[PDB]
Design an enzyme around this catalytic site. Sequence first.
Site, PDB file in Angstrom:
ATOM      1  N   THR A   1       0.938  -1.246   0.098  1.00 47.78           N
ATOM      2  CA  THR A   1       0.251  -0.052  -0.131  1.00 47.78           C
ATOM      3  C   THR A   1       0.853   1.180  -0.154  1.00 47.78           C
ATOM      4  N   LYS A   2       0.549   2.031  -0.946  1.00 48.23           N
ATOM      5  CA  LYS A   2       1.363   3.562  -0.902  1.00 48.23           C
ATOM      6  C   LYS A   2       0.940   4.399   0.071  1.00 48.23           C
TER       7      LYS A   2
ATOM      8  N   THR B   1     -11.524   4.791   0.937  1.00 46.69           N
ATOM      9  CA  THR B   1     -12.505   4.033   2.021  1.00 46.69           C
ATOM     10  C   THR B   1     -13.044   5.067   3.057  1.00 46.69           C
TER      11      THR B   1
ATOM     12  N   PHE C   1     -31.634   4.617   1.822  1.00 50.08           N
ATOM     13  CA  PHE C   1     -30.921   5.538   0.767  1.00 50.08           C
ATOM     14  C   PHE C   1     -31.732   5.523  -0.539  1.00 50.08           C
TER      15      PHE C   1
ATOM     16  N   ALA D   1       3.509  -0.074  -5.653  1.00 46.94           N
ATOM     17  CA  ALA D   1       3.435  -1.234  -6.682  1.00 46.94           C
ATOM     18  C   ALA D   1       3.712  -0.831  -7.921  1.00 46.94           C
TER      19      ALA D   1
ATOM     20  N   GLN E   1     -19.123   7.147 -13.444  1.00 43.23           N
ATOM     21  CA  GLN E   1     -20.193   7.617 -12.673  1.00 43.23           C
ATOM     22  C   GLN E   1     -19.919   9.084 -12.140  1.00 43.23           C
TER      23      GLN E   1
ATOM     24  N   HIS F   1     -21.206  12.772  -9.892  1.00 44.41           N
ATOM     25  CA  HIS F   1     -22.144  13.021  -8.854  1.00 44.41           C
ATOM     26  C   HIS F   1     -22.524  14.491  -9.403  1.00 44.41           C
TER      27      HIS F   1
ATOM     28  N   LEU G   1     -17.181  16.954  -2.867  1.00 45.43           N
ATOM     29  CA  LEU G   1     -18.384  16.561  -3.048  1.00 45.43           C
ATOM     30  C   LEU G   1     -19.418  17.549  -2.093  1.00 45.43           C
TER      31      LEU G   1
ATOM     32  N   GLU H   1     -26.209  15.668  -1.706  1.00 46.59           N
ATOM     33  CA  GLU H   1     -27.703  15.740  -2.160  1.00 46.59           C
ATOM     34  C   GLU H   1     -28.500  16.313  -1.101  1.00 46.59           C
TER      35      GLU H   1
ATOM     36  N   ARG I   1     -29.919  11.416 -10.331  1.00 47.99           N
ATOM     37  CA  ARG I   1     -28.593  12.265 -10.703  1.00 47.99           C
ATOM     38  C   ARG I   1     -28.233  12.257 -12.040  1.00 47.99           C
TER      39      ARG I   1
ATOM     40  N   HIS J   1     -17.143  10.640  -9.624  1.00 49.46           N
ATOM     41  CA  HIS J   1     -17.564  10.134  -8.197  1.00 49.46           C
ATOM     42  C   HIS J   1     -16.939   8.489  -8.087  1.00 49.46           C
TER      43      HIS J   1
ATOM     44  N   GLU K   1     -13.372  -1.073  -6.121  1.00 47.67           N
ATOM     45  CA  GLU K   1     -13.426  -0.233  -7.061  1.00 47.67           C
ATOM     46  C   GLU K   1     -12.555  -0.570  -8.455  1.00 47.67           C
TER      47      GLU K   1
ATOM     48  N   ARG L   1     -23.692   2.558 -10.572  1.00 53.16           N
ATOM     49  CA  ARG L   1     -23.567   2.021  -9.354  1.00 53.16           C
ATOM     50  C   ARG L   1     -24.621   2.545  -8.377  1.00 53.16           C
TER      51      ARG L   1
ATOM     52  N   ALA M   1     -24.511   2.963  -1.585  1.00 52.37           N
ATOM     53  CA  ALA M   1     -24.092   2.204  -0.434  1.00 52.37           C
ATOM     54  C   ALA M   1     -23.984   0.835  -0.793  1.00 52.37           C
TER      55      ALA M   1
ATOM     56  N   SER N   1     -21.051   0.227  -2.880  1.00 52.10           N
ATOM     57  CA  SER N   1     -19.672  -0.024  -3.001  1.00 52.10           C
ATOM     58  C   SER N   1     -18.986  -0.565  -1.860  1.00 52.10           C
TER      59      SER N   1
HETATM   60  C1  LIG Z   1     -14.611   9.018  -3.458  1.00 53.94           C
HETATM   61  C2  LIG Z   1     -15.859   8.630  -2.362  1.00 53.94           C
HETATM   62  C3  LIG Z   1     -16.322   7.497  -2.571  1.00 53.94           C
HETATM   63  C4  LIG Z   1     -17.413   6.993  -1.657  1.00 53.94           C
HETATM   64  C5  LIG Z   1     -17.965   7.858  -0.916  1.00 53.94           C
HETATM   65  C6  LIG Z   1     -17.441   9.238  -0.670  1.00 53.94           C
HETATM   66  C7  LIG Z   1     -16.405   9.669  -1.500  1.00 53.94           C
HETATM   67  C8  LIG Z   1     -15.862  10.945  -1.472  1.00 53.94           C
HETATM   68  N1  LIG Z   1     -18.760   7.581   0.115  1.00 53.94           N
HETATM   69  C9  LIG Z   1     -19.474   6.363  -0.162  1.00 53.94           C
HETATM   70  C10 LIG Z   1     -20.811   6.040   0.834  1.00 53.94           C
HETATM   71  O1  LIG Z   1     -21.317   6.678   1.476  1.00 53.94           O
HETATM   72  N2  LIG Z   1     -21.150   4.626   0.285  1.00 53.94           N
HETATM   73  C11 LIG Z   1     -20.789   3.790  -0.586  1.00 53.94           C
HETATM   74  O2  LIG Z   1     -21.372   2.635  -0.423  1.00 53.94           O
HETATM   75  N3  LIG Z   1     -19.531   4.205  -1.197  1.00 53.94           N
HETATM   76  C12 LIG Z   1     -18.992   5.392  -1.142  1.00 53.94           C
HETATM   77  N4  LIG Z   1     -18.018   5.665  -1.975  1.00 53.94           N
HETATM   78  C13 LIG Z   1     -17.442   4.525  -3.045  1.00 53.94           C
HETATM   79  C14 LIG Z   1     -16.671   3.668  -2.138  1.00 53.94           C
HETATM   80  O3  LIG Z   1     -16.743   3.996  -0.621  1.00 53.94           O
HETATM   81  C15 LIG Z   1     -15.073   3.651  -2.630  1.00 53.94           C
HETATM   82  O4  LIG Z   1     -15.258   3.353  -3.933  1.00 53.94           O
HETATM   83  C16 LIG Z   1     -14.466   2.540  -1.803  1.00 53.94           C
HETATM   84  O5  LIG Z   1     -14.278   3.033  -0.522  1.00 53.94           O
HETATM   85  C17 LIG Z   1     -12.911   2.092  -2.450  1.00 53.94           C
HETATM   86  O6  LIG Z   1     -12.587   0.989  -2.155  1.00 53.94           O
HETATM   87  P1  LIG Z   1     -11.151   0.316  -2.638  1.00 53.94           P
HETATM   88  O7  LIG Z   1     -10.459  -0.399  -1.444  1.00 53.94           O
HETATM   89  O8  LIG Z   1     -11.422  -0.554  -3.648  1.00 53.94           O
HETATM   90  O9  LIG Z   1     -10.354   1.552  -2.938  1.00 53.94           O
HETATM   91  P2  LIG Z   1      -9.479   2.563  -1.985  1.00 53.94           P
HETATM   92  O10 LIG Z   1     -10.419   2.796  -0.517  1.00 53.94           O
HETATM   93  O11 LIG Z   1      -9.122   3.810  -2.361  1.00 53.94           O
HETATM   94  O12 LIG Z   1      -8.178   1.614  -1.800  1.00 53.94           O
HETATM   95  C18 LIG Z   1      -7.124   1.719  -2.593  1.00 53.94           C
HETATM   96  C19 LIG Z   1      -5.846   1.121  -1.916  1.00 53.94           C
HETATM   97  O13 LIG Z   1      -4.958   0.853  -3.008  1.00 53.94           O
HETATM   98  C20 LIG Z   1      -3.762   1.547  -2.520  1.00 53.94           C
HETATM   99  N5  LIG Z   1      -2.981   1.592  -3.874  1.00 53.94           N
HETATM  100  C21 LIG Z   1      -3.424   2.295  -4.975  1.00 53.94           C
HETATM  101  N6  LIG Z   1      -2.350   2.238  -5.926  1.00 53.94           N
HETATM  102  C22 LIG Z   1      -1.337   1.852  -5.202  1.00 53.94           C
HETATM  103  C23 LIG Z   1       0.040   1.281  -5.787  1.00 53.94           C
HETATM  104  N7  LIG Z   1       0.566   1.700  -6.957  1.00 53.94           N
HETATM  105  N8  LIG Z   1       0.898   0.773  -4.901  1.00 53.94           N
HETATM  106  C24 LIG Z   1       0.320   0.301  -3.833  1.00 53.94           C
HETATM  107  N9  LIG Z   1      -1.049   0.515  -3.248  1.00 53.94           N
HETATM  108  C25 LIG Z   1      -1.579   1.387  -3.920  1.00 53.94           C
HETATM  109  C26 LIG Z   1      -4.219   2.673  -1.740  1.00 53.94           C
HETATM  110  O14 LIG Z   1      -2.954   3.205  -1.100  1.00 53.94           O
HETATM  111  C27 LIG Z   1      -5.425   2.157  -0.837  1.00 53.94           C
HETATM  112  O15 LIG Z   1      -4.768   1.598   0.248  1.00 53.94           O
HETATM  113  O1  LIG Z   2     -24.370  10.713  -0.432  1.00 52.24           O
HETATM  114  C1  LIG Z   2     -23.278  10.975  -1.371  1.00 52.24           C
HETATM  115  O2  LIG Z   2     -23.207  12.306  -2.113  1.00 52.24           O
HETATM  116  C2  LIG Z   2     -22.405   9.982  -1.790  1.00 52.24           C
HETATM  117  C3  LIG Z   2     -23.226   8.754  -2.227  1.00 52.24           C
HETATM  118  O3  LIG Z   2     -24.062   8.807  -3.060  1.00 52.24           O
HETATM  119  C4  LIG Z   2     -22.414   7.391  -2.161  1.00 52.24           C
HETATM  120  O4  LIG Z   2     -21.125   7.497  -2.416  1.00 52.24           O
HETATM  121  O5  LIG Z   2     -23.096   6.502  -1.777  1.00 52.24           O
HETATM  122  K   LIG Z   3     -15.142  -0.837 -10.756  1.00 51.40           K
END
Ligand SMILES: *Cc1cc2c(cc1C)nc1c(=O)[nH]c(=O)nc-1n2C[C@H](O)[C@H](O)[C@H](O)COP(=O)(O)OP(=O)(O)OC[C@H]1O[C@@H](n2cnc3c(N)ncnc32)[C@H](O)[C@@H]1O
Ligand SMILES: O=C([O-])CC(=O)C(=O)O
Ligand SMILES: [K+]
Lengths: 611, 113
Positions: A38-39, A47, A120, A168, A241, A243, A253, A256, A287, A354, A387, A398, A401, A403
Amino acid sequence: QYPVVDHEFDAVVVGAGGAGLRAAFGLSEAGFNTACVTKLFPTRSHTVAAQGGINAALGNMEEDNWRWHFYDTVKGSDWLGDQDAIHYMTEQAPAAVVELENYGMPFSRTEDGKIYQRAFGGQSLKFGKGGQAHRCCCVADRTGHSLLHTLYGRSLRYDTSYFVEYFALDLLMENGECRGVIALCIEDGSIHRIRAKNTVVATGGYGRTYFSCTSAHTSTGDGTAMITRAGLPCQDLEFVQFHPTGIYGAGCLITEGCRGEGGILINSQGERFMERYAPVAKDLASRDVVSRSMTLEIREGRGCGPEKDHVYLQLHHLPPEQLATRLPGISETAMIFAGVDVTKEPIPVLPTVHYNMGGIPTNYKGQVLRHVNGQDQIVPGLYACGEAACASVHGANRLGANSLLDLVVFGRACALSIEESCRPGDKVPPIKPNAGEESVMNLDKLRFADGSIRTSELRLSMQKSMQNHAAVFRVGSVLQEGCGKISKLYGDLKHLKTFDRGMVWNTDLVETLELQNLMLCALQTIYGAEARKESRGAHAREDYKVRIDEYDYSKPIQGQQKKPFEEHWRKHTLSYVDVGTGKVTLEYRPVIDKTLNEADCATVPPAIRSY
Amino acid sequence: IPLPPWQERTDESIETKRARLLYESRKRGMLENCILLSLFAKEHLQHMTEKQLNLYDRLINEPSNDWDIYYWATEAKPAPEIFENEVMALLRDFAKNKNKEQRLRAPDLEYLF
Ligand SMILES: *Cc1cc2c(cc1C)nc1c(=O)[nH]c(=O)nc-1n2C[C@H](O)[C@H](O)[C@H](O)COP(=O)(O)OP(=O)(O)OC[C@H]1O[C@@H](n2cnc3c(N)ncnc32)[C@H](O)[C@@H]1O
Ligand SMILES: O=C([O-])CC(=O)C(=O)O
Ligand SMILES: [K+]
């Protein structure tokens, strides 16, 4: 010039988000010597930004069935999602939430000790016949952090080896099989080959291909680029997708709830245009309707600002007590990032990236797929979830809730498939002595680059071109010009100029690596959007406004001639990029309509999209 | 529940400490802390003493939730006594923009070379 440290594990998980931590904790609990690259620090994953909840048909409020959640997800995917994965995700949703609660997540409970569930927007009951559903299980407003905190804590209890702040670079592939990942230690600059029999990619999205996204500057599609550099396909990358309400410029963000508490959308002529595009729902429409309405207002000439490229979100007609109590944090956000006092000024807003429905194609077990002669084939030792992966449970759009549900279900599914097909301590597959030399060569070239285009300048041009060509408004001539611009920007990667020549916390080098990953994601996104001549979910074109399925589902199916695969568009997009020349290649594979078992869950046939 | 108790690092040089804190300031979980901490690091990191760097290290790296750091800087929630110091005061001052600066995009790294 570069010593190469080697590590041997049973399995390696790239990413410490919700999906990566669930897969790493699951592999370690099953008894595997598991590494987690993880970076970031695990709690710094995107998350943590999730403040909503997780969908599950627990039934702790009304009577609910997970098959109704299945129907809502299939309908939301515009019948591009794979129904076998949607079946697996929705059915495993109640058991996953209860498993998370028993892991120690302080889920908000009710009076009788049952997990509280909110409503939701988009959840229904009785297969969509009627009745709002209560499936969103939330931990106050810190569900995303509580998920990261619980999974990372439990993973450390089983001796999960964490490579915190490691970037990575590429997959270690040999004869079409993944044997680990080669990564860069950001602290000292040493190259590490983390060898393993199975690799789980959970690197998040790639929203930073555009200029305005709601994600951090870390969502750079790194895992997507690794799969691309490995010659493996990426899936549905054009389905980005948006927002509707995001702050112009920053991309933060805007919830809504602002439009729910009385906020309205205003153009450059004082008009509440949502009264025209949706007289029923007004500013609280879907949306997609709100985003295309805003984009249409900006196109026709009613854009606000000195460049006329956004609209206003007005809240100052509400009393100040409602602006402070009913909408907490909106005043601080607008003032800090837009310099706006919401009690007297509107908020500059714009459709903002988003979520990425596309990514690495997998099956419902999390196994990464490739397309060999029109057939799906598992890549041995390679998994993806979250994701970064395309199950696809979200298809063309998508749901809310879902994701965080996608993270815990398929992160667990990746661990289950590895422990059901292998055993801890199995023979670590061997690799060539010079495995990863191409990655180190590319790293050394970026460090010793001194061309004409700076890294920030090329990144800004890419984000601008993606924002002006492959965003909400998509039409043939604009998409084709965008493809030429992005291809020209990919050729300009040979003109990069960096400054930090050392190896001690070279942030300049890290961001230049991410720019390479962004360009690969941008090329596949914009070429896939240009090719897909239809309208489905988050993809809406003006030259092709109708969803093109194998049948015309506005009329009786039987009595029509089923269009062949090469003529309709109810099919996943598969994109390849020749890294040397930047040439994009597009293939297609069918959408899985069969469920895991028809006796337990019935296939939902396609239907015309009802807004 | 117990995570690693955050340790104050005293083995790296002052230039390595600034470079590490620059990376850990730009690479945050939310976009709000990404913009603020990267712009706050642009204006203060190269001028901070080791005392201030160690306080800034603990402020942005000890709290598990990025939202907690954001609510302390915006004064939406009271910061703990262990964080109420001079660097937290500069962060509150930087959050309440007085010279009316950009606060839109993270600063390009061309200001260091
Ligand atoms: C952006 C966003 C998304 C979101 C949300 C609000 C915002 C501002 N609110 C949500 C909500 O209320 N309910 C829901 O169901 N979803 C919501 N989302 C979307 C969702 O939470 C996210 O899409 C999800 O959390 C993403 O999960 P994922 O684990 O797949 O992605 P990540 O949390 O960003 O973790 C990525 C990890 O990978 C590591 N990484 C990335 N690149 C590298 C490299 N090159 N080398 C090593 N590690 C790497 C990152 O460091 C991280 O740990
Ligand atoms: O409530 C928001 O604006 C964020 C959202 O829809 C989600 O990622 O589930
Ligand atoms: K995806």
